[PDB]
């Protein structure tokens, strides 16, 4: 392939490439909002949280820090923020 | 001239590999350099299986095997004819020789 | 001569030379 359009890559190969090796850098992480059952507060947590996030209104754990991505405690709902 | 790319051994990302003694002449040889043969021989000769089966106190008795791992230095390996010299192109192949089942 | 044995011979000779020099 001697004529690859390096300057309009389709989002597929753009997304599968490494974050720094993208044409313009884009973090793979994001922010999500998490819903503990029985709580009204909408807690915004990092998708790669390294710490134990907690509800200020109830003593329960929300995400378990893991290698790359925080693992959300079961029974919790989450949706993407602004894609 | 460099005869073999791997220098006649399998040591790649290591500095030192512990040695073993050749089973034939008791020469120290690096473990990956040595030729290893895993011989699985019947404990009895095929010509004596019938005699042992007839002289057995059991009816369906399976013959035990003989599980032995052999290490040769390449001197003994070439001398005992387990390995052979090959052409320059044939040295580039690593496929084990065929079993010859029929 | 194998280079190792030439080296060993030369080391012997150097020891002897140092000995004779020390005797003076």
């Amino acid at each position: 392939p001697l004529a690859k359009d390096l300057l309009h890559p389709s989002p597929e190969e753009e997304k599968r490439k490494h974050k720094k090796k993208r044409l313009v850098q884009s973090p793979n992480s994001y922010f999500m909002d998490v819903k503990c059952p029985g709580c009204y507060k909408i807690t915004t947590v990092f998708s790669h949280a390294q710490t134990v996030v907690l509800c200020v209104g109830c003593s329960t754990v929300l995400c378990q820090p893991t290698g790359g991505k925080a693992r959300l405690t079961e029974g919790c709902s989450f949706r993407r923020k602004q894609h | 001239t460099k005869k073999r790319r791997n220098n006649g051994r399998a040591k790649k990302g290591r500095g030192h590999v512990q040695p073993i003694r050749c089973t034939n002449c008791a020469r120290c040889v690096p473990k990956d350099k040595a030729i290893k043969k895993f011989v699985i021989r019947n404990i009895v000769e095929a010509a004596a299986v019938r005699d042992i089966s007839e002289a057995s106190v059991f009816d369906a008795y399976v013959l035990p095997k003989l599980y032995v791992k052999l290490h040769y230095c390449v001197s003994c390996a070439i001398h005992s004819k387990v390995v052979r010299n090959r052409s320059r192109e044939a040295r580039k192949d690593r496929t084990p020789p065929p079993r010859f089942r029929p | 001569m194998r280079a190792k044995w030439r080296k060993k011979r030369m080391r012997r000779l150097k020891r002897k030379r140092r000995k004779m020099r020390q005797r003076s």
């Binding site: - | 008791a26 404990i43 004596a48 106190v57 | -």
Partner: protein, 137 residues
């Protein structure tokens, strides 16, 4: 009297045969079932007088034949096998006399039980003799 055990006909008595089939010589030792008490032991070296054939298959054949004759005369009619090589830090393959010895024990009419390799395998041994350059021949 026959110097034997009081046994029936449809059943049989079992001894233990230790074949130390090294090179340079072979052993056709036969003991009792516990192994402490021995019945008869003949070697290939006591059946040839040439010192070359002490590990030859024929010497083991003669020794196994005489062990069989002695055991039958005493009243032992079945044997287990515990084959052994030199072992230790030395070689693990049995000598040439193992095969002929076992074939002779079978052919002589003696019955055979469990066959087992009991060669002394080290979890790790001392330094094997010969030096790091081996046995130059």
């Amino acid at each position: 009297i026959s110097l034997g055990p009081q046994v029936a006909e449809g059943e049989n008595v079992f001894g233990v045969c230790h074949i130390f089939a090294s090179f340079n010589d072979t052993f056709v030792h036969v003991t009792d079932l516990s192994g402490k008490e021995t019945i008869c032991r003949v070697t290939g070296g006591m059946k040839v007088k040439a010192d070359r054939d002490e590990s030859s298959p024929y010497a083991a054949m003669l020794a196994a034949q005489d062990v069989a004759q002695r055991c039958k005369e005493l009243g032992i009619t079945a044997l287990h096998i515990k084959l052994r090589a030199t072992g230790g830090n030395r070689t693990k393959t049995p000598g040439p006399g193992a095969q002929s010895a076992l074939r002779a024990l079978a052919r002589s009419g003696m019955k055979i039980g469990r066959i087992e390799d009991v060669t002394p395998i080290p979890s790790d041994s001392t330094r094997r003799k010969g030096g790091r350059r081996g046995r130059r021949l």
